């Protein structure tokens, strides 16, 4: 425990929603987040204006305009206007880079106190490119991998690692299962921060109150039969469906990271500490791989072997690519979403990487001192992998 | 002590925006061939950056952040090294090497670059659906939709610049960034674009070289610009040519631990000593800089009158001058080569970019020209600023 340690002293999510059609469709990204936010301010009672900054992952829709929510956002979780903001996009790994650029910028000194979090609103944010493509693109295998859809990438690691179909169905049926298994258990109560919104009926107009405070994605009653049913969506002899695909969703998550000193000071429970965040490249045809480069990276920063690692969130991207980084890196499936994943719970983009943090520490503190070590990792579109090593608090 | 040090930094020429000379190239195509040239300048192998942080705008974001994949593509790095965007509005591409250097103090890696890019040919600033009717809730809120200009006419009115102030110091400006490409005090910091020029009427191609900064108009004059009018308020004095001007453009940095320059025996172009970033009033936001160069200099152990050159971006003449004037800081000492009324101010780019032409010119000026300073003011109420200590 040396006082420079970067640690973690909350951390939150909104619910998870449904885009399109779920609890959250009719919310605005600033309203999703900036609820996280304070409860961040709420659980530690610190001074808002003793934060050093506020970096949000997000990654659909322009820039400036999503930037200029989170400086609203932090307006409405009552953050002074002293307290800055900004953005970072490295795809699906959003959320988490924010984290570990907060974790970076308090260990080079330039503040004690700072948020990392994530925001996507799959449901305002569409995801298609905007203008035509550079001829100079399909000159160059690797930048015309690039836009390759996720899907067909998918079926890449599938047929290079040879991931059965069944496999991949099993993998969603186990995702399925134990989200609803946790939100029954009310594992997910403690990291959930309910949403007081509105719902918009489309026929006439009107408004209605509403709080959303439970994820609406899951559906309990999946069957591997099932899945057995679904057509192949990138692929006619493809074995990537929907059901092995993550879900287009809407949610929010929020960290408070600080010196460690400084928690003491404060006498601030510590959630969480930071210990190494690596992001690396790889193929973008099979960017799915990313985890399974990504976590040896972090976990060798870490002084660390992979068996030390008591528990896993890696996003399920597509369960083709989650099944073969669990088997390429050799990992008790055991220990791996041990409440879910997004192939249930959904995948809002630049959030998932920051609610995964609060996901692993929370899960990681029920389970008490034995569980030591975490890992967030992710594969990210384009050919990238991201991965962070936490330790428990107290 | 194992400082953060800068071995490379590079531009591309700052062109008018969807008429200038890059308005026919691609986002990927004026990042690339400035990244390419930081691993040209330096011999190192591509594959030793640890990752490649752009920041960057007004695209959409899932976009951009492709368009810079490919572009490092482009300019031969291989697919192992990673890269992502960062967006802190008008401080983008500042903002992206302060992140590349907090990384390797951090010790997350030991190499990497810090780059901003923007085409604003290609990107609209633009509001997708309905604002959140909370704003109407929350001055501060409602605040940060506030058109630049009308922040700009803000700070005006509230500390007394008057037009006659602004409009000399836009003549200042044109005139410093011809005397400075004239001089060839560019040369050194850009890197010219092949790219090519379409005739919008025939369609009919030609191949050119971008090599000078386009927007620059050396006749600029008090009595031009007295007959513009303002734009954003009838009784204001805010004119298109005492605001920045809309441009396309990149900037890279490449940077590294001291003991990895000394190792490669590569010369240190310039040090990174500090980086703040911090929240003013949106209203005004054009105080930026008055509020972040002293929260930079302080966390440097330094004091104002240390700093020997400024580079602060001029986004209106309005605040660029009363930001000068709140710091009592000798205007001899402020954008010497010129800055964005007359070479525009490619959102992302400009914080980047900025970075190459202060390390350059101070290097130029020799040993006594030992601290400089980026900062800029930030939409949304925000300024940020970096002090960097000359190389060697």
Known sequence: ??????????????????????????????????????????????????????????????????????????????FPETVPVRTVNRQCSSGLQAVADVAAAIKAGFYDIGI?????????NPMAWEGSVN???????????????????????????????????QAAVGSHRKTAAATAAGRFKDEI???????????????????ISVDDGIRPGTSLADLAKLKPVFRKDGSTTAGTSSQVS?????????????????????????????????????????????????VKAAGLQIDDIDLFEINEAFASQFVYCQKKLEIDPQKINVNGGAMAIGHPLGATGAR????????????????????????????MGAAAVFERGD
Not at 14 to 39: E, F, N, Q
């Open 116 to 124: 990392g979090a994530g925001l996507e609103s799959m449901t305002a």
């Open 356 to 383: 995964c943090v609060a996901t692993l520490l929370h899960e990681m503190k029920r389970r008490g001192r034995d569980c030591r070590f975490g890992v967030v990792s992710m594969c990210i579109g384009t050919g």
């Open 135 to 169: 001829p100079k693109v399909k000159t160059m295998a690797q930048a015309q991998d690039c836009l390759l859809p996720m899907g067909i990438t998918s079926e890449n690691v599938a047929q290079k690692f040879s991931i059965t179909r069944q496999e991949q169905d």
């Open 1 to 78: 425990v040396f006082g420079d340690d970067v640690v973690i002293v909350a951390a939150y999510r909104s619910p998870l929603c449904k885009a399109k059609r779920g609890g959250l469709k009719d919310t605005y990204p600033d309203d999703i987040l900036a609820p996280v936010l304070k409860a961040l301010i709420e659980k530690t009672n610190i001074n808002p204006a003793e934060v050093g900054d506020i970096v949000v992952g997000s990654v659909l829709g322009a820039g400036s305009q999503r930037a200029s929510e989170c400086r609203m956002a932090a307006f409405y979780a009552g």
């Open 193 to 211: 921060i309910p949403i007081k919104t509105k719902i918009v009926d489309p026929k006439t107009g009107d408004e209605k109150p509403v709080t």
């Open 250 to 298: 809407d949610g929010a998550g929020a960290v408070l990271l600080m010196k460690r000193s400084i928690a003491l000071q404060k006498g601030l429970p510590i959630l969480g500490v930071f210990r190494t965040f690596a992001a690396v490249g790889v193929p973008p045809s099979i960017m799915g791989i990313g985890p399974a480069v990504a976590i040896p990276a972090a």
